[PDB]
Design a protein around this ligand. Structure first.
Ligand SMILES: *Cc1cc(C*)cc(C*)c1
Lengths: 20, 20, 20
């Protein structure tokens, strides 16, 4: 439940945006 | 053997902490 | 096609460098 979890979510978006 | 390897280790911890 | 894609490329290099 740590706030750092937000960073992980961003990573996922970054990977998807890789095609962008 | 580069010191940057430490960053990779942190990434792993971040992924696990994702459930936190 | 976003410039952020460069960050993703770096991540890949970091993972490989993990053995370094
Ligand atoms: C979340 C994350 C972590 C690492 C080590 C690298 C990338 C691209 C994303």
């Amino acid at each position: 439940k740590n706030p750092e979890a937000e960073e992980i979510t961003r990573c996922k978006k970054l990977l998807d945006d890789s095609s962008s």
